Design a protein around this ligand. Structure first.
Ligand SMILES: *[C@@H]1O[C@H](CO)[C@@H](O[C@@H]2O[C@H](CO)[C@@H](O[C@@H]3O[C@H](CO[C@H]4O[C@H](CO[C@H]5O[C@H](CO)[C@@H](O)[C@H](O)[C@@H]5O)[C@@H](O)[C@H](O)[C@@H]4O)[C@@H](O)[C@H](O[C@H]4O[C@H](CO)[C@@H](O)[C@H](O)[C@@H]4O[C@H]4O[C@H](CO)[C@@H](O)[C@H](O)[C@@H]4O[C@H]4O[C@H](CO)[C@@H](O)[C@H](O)[C@@H]4O)[C@@H]3O)[C@H](O)[C@H]2NC(C)=O)[C@H](O)[C@H]1NC(C)=O
Ligand SMILES: *[C@@H]1O[C@H](CO)[C@@H](O[C@@H]2O[C@H](CO)[C@@H](O[C@@H]3O[C@H](CO)[C@@H](O)[C@H](O[C@H]4O[C@H](CO)[C@@H](O)[C@H](O)[C@@H]4O)[C@@H]3O)[C@H](O)[C@H]2NC(C)=O)[C@H](O)[C@H]1NC(C)=O
Ligand SMILES: *[C@@H]1O[C@H](CO)[C@@H](O[C@@H]2O[C@H](CO)[C@@H](O[C@@H]3O[C@H](CO)[C@@H](O)[C@H](O)[C@@H]3O)[C@H](O)[C@H]2NC(C)=O)[C@H](O)[C@H]1NC(C)=O
Ligand SMILES: *[C@@H]1O[C@H](CO)[C@@H](O[C@@H]2O[C@H](CO)[C@@H](O)[C@H](O)[C@H]2NC(C)=O)[C@H](O)[C@H]1NC(C)=O
Ligand SMILES: *[C@@H]1O[C@H](CO)[C@@H](O[C@@H]2O[C@H](CO)[C@@H](O)[C@H](O)[C@H]2NC(C)=O)[C@H](O)[C@H]1NC(C)=O
Ligand SMILES: *[C@@H]1O[C@H](CO)[C@@H](O[C@@H]2O[C@H](CO)[C@@H](O)[C@H](O)[C@H]2NC(C)=O)[C@H](O)[C@H]1NC(C)=O
Ligand SMILES: *[C@@H]1O[C@H](CO)[C@@H](O[C@@H]2O[C@H](CO)[C@@H](O)[C@H](O)[C@H]2NC(C)=O)[C@H](O)[C@H]1NC(C)=O
Ligand SMILES: *[C@@H]1O[C@H](CO)[C@@H](O[C@@H]2O[C@H](CO)[C@@H](O)[C@H](O)[C@H]2NC(C)=O)[C@H](O)[C@H]1NC(C)=O
Ligand SMILES: *[C@@H]1O[C@H](CO)[C@@H](O[C@@H]2O[C@H](CO)[C@@H](O)[C@H](O)[C@H]2NC(C)=O)[C@H](O)[C@H]1NC(C)=O
Ligand SMILES: *[C@@H]1O[C@H](CO)[C@@H](O[C@@H]2O[C@H](CO)[C@@H](O)[C@H](O)[C@H]2NC(C)=O)[C@H](O)[C@H]1NC(C)=O
Ligand SMILES: *[C@@H]1O[C@H](CO)[C@@H](O[C@@H]2O[C@H](CO)[C@@H](O)[C@H](O)[C@H]2NC(C)=O)[C@H](O)[C@H]1NC(C)=O
Ligand SMILES: *[C@@H]1O[C@H](CO)[C@@H](O)[C@H](O)[C@H]1NC(C)=O
Ligand SMILES: *[C@@H]1O[C@H](CO)[C@@H](O)[C@H](O)[C@H]1NC(C)=O
Ligand SMILES: *[C@@H]1O[C@H](CO)[C@@H](O)[C@H](O)[C@H]1NC(C)=O
Ligand SMILES: *[C@@H]1O[C@H](CO)[C@@H](O)[C@H](O)[C@H]1NC(C)=O
Lengths: 104, 292, 227, 230, 211
């Protein structure tokens, strides 16, 4: 077993100037492939606006990555403040979150 | 621009599907297979007497070992004496069901892919002092050869009748080059060091032994004939048989070589064959085991 | 050698119809049956049909009635019997017909059946998508300022695939991750591509994401730096 | 290593033996094969013919037999002589040398190769035209400076056969010296105008003579620029 | 003969146009207008001294791939004609060049004009001629107009130019001679030199008492 180094990539103005921005949770260098990666918008559970992809087991490290997205409209991101993800594994004894409050 | 030509580019009429309509077709015939009538107008070498039968394309002529076997009530006896010059008693005899597999190869002046001797070179003739008898030579070690046709060719598909086509030479995709064969020089000069050595036990020690080249004839007997790869090579061997003997690395001998595709084997009256062209360049490797 | 050359890669719109050819050689083409199978990306294999040469007798699946049709082309040469060409027309395309089609022959046998499949063609992908050809843009990814951190870019809303993305043109290869193409957001794909570097070099170097969408001749280069 | 200068009269009359002589230094001319190429204006380039070291004479089968090359080894002077010249022989003449190569593609001593050449020294070119006109001496007037750097100039009016060479300080001034095309007169003549940048703190000091050369009319000119209050 | 056009820095590709047969030995030249040709590629692959390393032929080709010239990055002084000289084995002795392509580069700066002014030279005002001369340069592009008004009135008589043409510094030029006389000077108070580029006009004025 191993532990992925959790990130949170903030919603840039580079995509919100087009009207749909990308809040990107990003896990790297873990095994097993299964994971329960959740997310929250202003501390509230959303759905139906995500496309999550896994990768394959590498030939050198034999590990995995994961990248989820949370694509909303431009009215919806500036409406809220507290953006955070949730990470949960067999190999973690505690739920890990990281944050990026919007505007702060 | 003529340096020394080989191919000729021709033109003629040929029937289409419907046998009342005529069209212009061309081909690329060698100059040995084309003779002159009188811009200019030519024709094939044997429209007088012979019916040139095109060898089927589904055929394949190739050396494959034939074992000669005797039916019941008969047996074949094999000598195993290693000094057997060809006549008289053989003190070591063993009955065999079927002989070893000889590979039928039809060549002249040199014996290709043959069977080797055992200890030394074996010189072998009938009435040695008689001139008209040939002298069979057999080697104990093979002498390798490398042969090629270094120009690339394709095939046309000029039809003749319903279901029966005809193949001809179409294009020279590349560059015009002469077909040739290599014999190594240091192996050939040592293989003649043995044939001279045991000729002198039949004639005399203090004699001078020389090799000349030829004195005339057709291409079948002045040169070295093959049958390799589907084509018929006639190589000029005046560079091998040229040396004297006086009783005391990598440089190969090149042999220039001609090609013709209308052959008449055994010279039967009014009969001739035809070899269809091979698509692509040709490569051959062979051993020389013996002389005549 | 028993060769089975299948062609070729097709992109079509829904409602259309595709014809896929399958050239065979190295055996007598008038003797052996030729199966057609389809490999769904999330349902597994599916047997389309079955053609027998020398007369052209065919049979299909029963869920693919009224749409598929297949025939052949017999070589007529008395001096070359060993080649032949098969065909297949698969009409009534919808986006759920996108998969990879195969043209599968059996092997020589004494005690077995017809369906054991020995010689396999390379396959071809038939894409059915109403999206039109569109270039990718590029959008940078970085932290604001010890421990390693993800630089990267986002290559969003292109059609069709594949995008080949290199880094600093192109020697920065270690620590480089790519994701498979994110699925259709209104018919368009995206690619995530992130590179892990220690966080000291973020404030030192300028990093480049080299998008190369070849079917549209689009090429973009975003600089990635801690903003 | 090898230095090549072209010489030749600017105007010759039609139906006359042309002569272009190639000044050669270095004396390494007997390691090379010599040739001439030409560009009739408005076309690409075309060769003329080969002279060897053993003097094997070949020429292009796109001209007639009216071409002859001679080569001297004593004065080291090549010669080109187009006989029975016409206005079709209006071109620019480059003298050139070439080495030999051979691209072997098979067995050597069966003759399976060919030769290929390439050119290594480029000359300076001589321009020759053909007409029944005669050579006209110029009318040269040096142009005075202005008060700014400063604008030194010269005029060569009434000259044909063209081009014109204009230099300065008896050839010794090469900094800031440039000429433009001599503008075509309607009278069939040409008027060169020169432009030379000199500082004004120096231009009113040294002996600025408009230096011209003219080989086809056989005249040399040296006239002094005079100062003026522009 | 044949144009070609890439941007400054963009990789130029020049196919020859000689359907070569057999074995070949291609040569490429730089014929830069105003000078003599320059042997770029020798025997398919050799770049002699005096040729920059940004030019390279095709050394790695087997039998049947078309020879093409690859210029990596183009500098301003690289507009020239690029002849492909191609000898073969299935042809005679080859005396035809075959073209060629002119790499005319785009994205070149910039039109920044000037006029150089020249007097009525007092040595031939006594011979009843005027040496009013403008000498114009420093362009890109170089298709430029020169003009000469009689204080508001356009004159065209006595004026002779050429076409525009390049300098050595990769910018264009335009020059002009005027056959005015001291009868044609003193009729008007002044003449004025006019140069236009792309709609913009340079105005310079002269006089017999202010040159
Ligand atoms: C019977 O025996 C006979 C004799 O024993 C055999 O006859 C021989 O037949 C072959 C053909 O099958 C002939 O080969 C040809 O010879 C050319 C002449 O060679 C000159 O240059 C030699 C350079 O030596 C180097 O290279 C060779 C091979 O590359 C190598 O063996 C040697 O050790 C050394 O590394 C020099 O040694 C010779 O003495 C000659 O001076 C030879 O150049 C030909 O090769 C050409 O052409 C072919 C086809 O065009 C190309 O594929 C080759 O790559 C090569 O072309 C290269 O050079 C050209 C410039 O001339 C370029 O245009 C090409 O692009 C290419 O350039 C690349 O490769 C070069 C090699 O590194 C580099 O320098 C370049 O920069 C590029 O990378 C051709 O092979 C023999 O000459 C001939 N021998 C005799 C004595 O006549 C006969 O075959 C035998 N028959 C049988 C059936 O066995
Ligand atoms: C003396 O003995 C030697 C040793 O056997 C013999 O050399 C053999 O020659 C045959 C010529 O048929 C070679 O067979 C060919 O080998 C090549 C190698 O790549 C194959 O490509 C060939 O396959 C083709 O065969 C037909 C030709 O048209 C086609 O119908 C077919 O589809 C293939 O295209 C073919 O197998 C054989 O390999 C060599 N042997 C060795 C060990 O190399 C030589 O011929 C003998 N001397 C004489 C004069 O016969
Ligand atoms: C091939 O080998 C055989 C046997 O090894 C050779 O046969 C031998 O030939 C010689 C010829 O002179 C015979 O010698 C003669 O014998 C008779 C009596 O038979 C005698 O009258 C003569 O004076 C002379 O001695 C010899 O007998 C014979 N060998 C045997 C075993 O009979 C044959 O010559 C060899 N072939 C060649 C071409 O050398
Ligand atoms: C085609 O090649 C042949 C073979 O060289 C040329 O044949 C010549 O024919 C004339 C006719 O009498 C002979 O005198 C010559 O001796 C032959 N050989 C040579 C080398 O000239 C023939 O000339 C060629 N075809 C044409 C149209 O020239
Ligand atoms: C042999 O001759 C034929 C014609 O007699 C040549 O075929 C011609 O090739 C040219 C190529 O420049 C084509 O434009 C013509 O249309 C061809 N003619 C026909 C009837 O097809 C052929 O190239 C010659 N072969 C060789 C090796 O020289
Ligand atoms: C068919 O045979 C005739 C007769 O030999 C050949 O014509 C030539 O005839 C004269 C007189 O009869 C002989 O002196 C010549 O030697 C003959 N020429 C040749 C080449 O043999 C005719 O050429 C022959 N045709 C064919 C296709 O071989
Ligand atoms: C002889 O010529 C044939 C063409 O007639 C050559 O075959 C080609 O080879 C190239 C290189 O592998 C392929 O790209 C082509 O597809 C081939 N053409 C065909 C029709 O198959 C062949 O390589 C040549 N042989 C030699 C020794 O040069
Ligand atoms: C005939 O051709 C064969 C290749 O088919 C040659 O064998 C090669 O010889 C060289 C030089 O000794 C070796 O480096 C190679 O390893 C040999 N090839 C193999 C497969 O062993 C042979 O030398 C040629 N013979 C002659 C007389 O030229
Ligand atoms: C080898 O045989 C050739 C012919 O098979 C002989 O060649 C002749 O040589 C003489 C010189 O003595 C020439 O005048 C003839 O023209 C040649 N004949 C041909 C057909 O060209 C040669 O003499 C023989 N011997 C040697 C040592 O080469
Ligand atoms: C077989 O090859 C020999 C040479 O290896 C040929 O002899 C040459 O014949 C020509 C014809 O006059 C001469 O020009 C050459 O000088 C000869 N070569 C030598 C080395 O003397 C011989 O002619 C060839 N055989 C045939 C039938 O042509
Ligand atoms: C042609 O000669 C070669 C050389 O003898 C044969 O190849 C083998 O060569 C090795 C040498 O390392 C010998 O030990 C073998 O006995 C040879 N024969 C075999 C069958 O391996 C080659 O076989 C000869 N060609 C034919 C048709 O017999
Ligand atoms: C072969 O070798 C012998 C002995 O070394 C030598 O006398 C002879 O000149 C060589 N060459 C030929 C062609 O016999
Ligand atoms: C010839 O040489 C052989 C070699 O051993 C010898 O036995 C024989 O007696 C010799 N003959 C003569 C006549 O010298
Ligand atoms: C025949 O022998 C002589 C004398 O050794 C030699 O010069 C000549 O080249 C030989 N002939 C051939 C065709 O090699
Ligand atoms: C068909 O039944 C026979 C009965 O012996 C059996 O041997 C064979 O394996 C069966 N075929 C298949 C394809 O299962």
């Amino acid at each position: 077993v191993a532990a992925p180094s959790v990130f949170i990539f903030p919603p840039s103005d580079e995509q919100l100037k087009s009207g749909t921005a990308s809040v990107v949770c990003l896990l790297n260098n873990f095994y097993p492939r299964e994971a329960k990666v959740q997310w929250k918008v202003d501390n509230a559970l959303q759905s139906g606006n995500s496309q999550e992809s896994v990768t394959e087991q590498d030939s050198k490290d034999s590990t995995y990555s994961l990248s989820s997205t949370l694509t909303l409209s431009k009215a919806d991101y500036e409406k809220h403040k507290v953006y955070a993800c949730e990470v949960t594994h067999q190999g973690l004894s505690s739920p890990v979150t990281k944050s990026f409050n919007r505007g702060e | 621009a003529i340096t020394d030509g080989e191919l000729k580019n021709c033109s003629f009429n040929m029937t289409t599907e419907l046998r009342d309509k005529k069209q212009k077709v061309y081909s690329l015939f060698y100059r040995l297979d084309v003779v002159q009538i009188n811009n200019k107008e030519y024709r094939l070498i044997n429209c007088n007497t012979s019916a040139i039968t095109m060898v089927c394309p589904k055929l394949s002529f190739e050396p494959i070992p034939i074992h000669y076997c005797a039916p019941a009530g008969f047996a074949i006896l094999k000598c195993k004496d290693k000094k057997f010059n060809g006549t008289g008693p053989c003190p070591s005899v063993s009955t065999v069901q079927c002989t070893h597999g000889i590979k039928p190869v039809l060549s002249t002046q040199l014996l290709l892919n043959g069977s080797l001797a055992e200890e030394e070179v074996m010189i072998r003739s009938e009435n040695i002092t008689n001139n008209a008898k040939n002298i069979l030579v057999q080697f104990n070690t093979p002498v390798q050869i490398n042969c090629t046709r270094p120009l690339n060719l394709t095939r046309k598909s000029i039809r003749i009748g319903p279901g029966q086509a005809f193949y001809a030479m179409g294009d020279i995709i590349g560059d015009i080059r002469q077909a040739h064969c290599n014999v190594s020089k240091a192996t050939w000069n040592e293989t003649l060091g043995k044939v001279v050595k045991q000729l002198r036990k039949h004639f005399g020690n203090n004699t001078i032994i020389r090799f000349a080249n030829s004195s005339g004839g057709d291409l079948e007997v002045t040169t070295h004939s093959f049958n390799c790869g589907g084509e018929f090579f006639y190589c000029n061997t005046s560079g091998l048989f040229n040396s004297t003997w006086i009783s005391n690395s990598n440089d190969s001998i090149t042999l220039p070589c001609r090609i013709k595709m209308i052959i008449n084997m055994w010279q039967r009256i009014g009969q001739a064959m035809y070899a269809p062209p091979i698509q692509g360049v040709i490569r051959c490797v062979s051993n020389i085991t013996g002389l005549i | 050698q028993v060769q089975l050359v299948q062609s070729g890669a097709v992109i079509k719109t829904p409602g259309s119809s595709v014809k896929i050819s399958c050239r065979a050689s190295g055996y007598n083409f008038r003797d052996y049956s030729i199966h057609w199978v389809r490999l769904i990306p999330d349902k597994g294999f599916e047997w389309i049909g079955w053609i027998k040469p020398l007369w052209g007798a065919v049979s299909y699946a029963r869920q693919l009635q009224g749409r598929v049709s297949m025939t052949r082309q017999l070589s007529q040469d008395p001096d070359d019997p060993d080649w032949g060409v098969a065909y297949m027309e698969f009409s009534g395309l919808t986006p759920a017909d996108t998969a990879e089609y195969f043209c599968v022959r059996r092997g020589s046998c004494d005690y077995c059946g017809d369906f054991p499949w020995q010689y396999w063609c390379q396959g071809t992908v038939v894409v059915v998508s109403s999206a039109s050809t569109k270039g990718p843009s590029v959008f940078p990814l970085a932290p604001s300022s010890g421990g390693t951190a993800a630089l990267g870019c986002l290559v969003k809303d292109y059609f069709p695939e594949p995008v080949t993305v290199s880094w600093n043109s192109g020697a920065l290869t270690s620590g480089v991750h790519t994701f498979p193409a994110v699925l259709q957001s209104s018919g368009l794909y995206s690619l995530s591509s992130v590179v892990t570097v220690p966080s000291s070099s973020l404030g030192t170097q300028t990093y480049i994401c080299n998008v190369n969408h070849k079917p549209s001749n689009t090429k973009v280069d975003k600089k990635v730096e801690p903003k | 290593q090898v230095q090549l200068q072209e010489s030749g009269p600017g105007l010759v009359k039609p139906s006359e033996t042309l002569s272009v002589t190639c000044s050669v230094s270095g004396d390494s001319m007997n390691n090379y094969y010599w040739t001439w190429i030409r560009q009739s204006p408005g076309k690409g380039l075309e060769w003329i013919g080969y002279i060897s070291d053993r003097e094997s004479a070949t020429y292009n089968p796109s001209l007639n037999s009216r071409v002859v090359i001679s080569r001297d080894t004593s004065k080291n002077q090549l010669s080109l002589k187009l006989n029975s010249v016409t206005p079709a022989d209006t071109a620019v003449y480059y003298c050139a040398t070439a080495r030999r190569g051979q691209r072997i593609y098979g067995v050597v001593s069966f003759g399976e190769f060919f030769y290929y050449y390439s050119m290594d020294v480029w000359g300076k070119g001589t321009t020759v035209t053909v007409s029944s006109a005669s050579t006209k001496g110029p009318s040269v007037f040096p142009l005075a400076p202005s008060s700014k750097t400063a604008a030194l100039g010269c005029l060569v009016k009434d000259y044909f056969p063209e081009p014109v060479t204009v230099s300065w300080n008896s050839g010794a001034l090469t900094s800031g010296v440039h000429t433009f095309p001599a503008v075509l007169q309607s009278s069939g003549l040409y008027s060169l105008s020169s432009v030379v940048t000199v500082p004004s703190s120096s231009l009113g000091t040294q002996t600025y003579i408009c230096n011209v050369n003219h080989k086809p009319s056989n005249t040399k000119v040296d006239k002094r620029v005079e100062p003026k209050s522009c | 003969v044949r144009p070609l056009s890439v941007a400054l820095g963009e990789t130029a590709r020049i196919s020859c146009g000689r359907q070569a047969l057999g074995s070949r030995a291609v040569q490429w030249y730089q014929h830069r207008p105003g000078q003599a040709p320059i042997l770029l590629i020798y025997n398919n692959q050799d770049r002699p001294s005096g040729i920059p390393e940004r030019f390279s032929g095709t050394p790695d080709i087997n039998f049947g791939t078309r020879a093409t010239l690859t210029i990596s990055g183009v500098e301003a002084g690289d507009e020239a004609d690029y002849y492909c000289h191609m000898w073969d084995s299935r042809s005679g002795f080859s005396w035809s060049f075959g073209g060629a392509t002119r790499l005319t580069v785009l994205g070149q700066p910039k039109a920044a004009p000037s006029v150089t002014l020249f007097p009525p030279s007092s040595e031939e005002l006594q011979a009843n001629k005027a040496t009013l001369v403008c000498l114009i340069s420093d362009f890109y592009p170089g298709a430029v107009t020169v003009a000469w008004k009689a204080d508001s009135s356009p004159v065209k008589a006595g004026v002779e130019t050429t076409t525009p043409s390049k300098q050595s510094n990769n910018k264009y030029a335009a020059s002009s001679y005027l056959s005015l006389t001291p009868e044609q000077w003193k009729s008007h108070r002044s003449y004025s030199c006019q140069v236009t580029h792309e709609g913009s006009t340079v105005e310079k004025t002269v006089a017999p008492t202010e040159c």
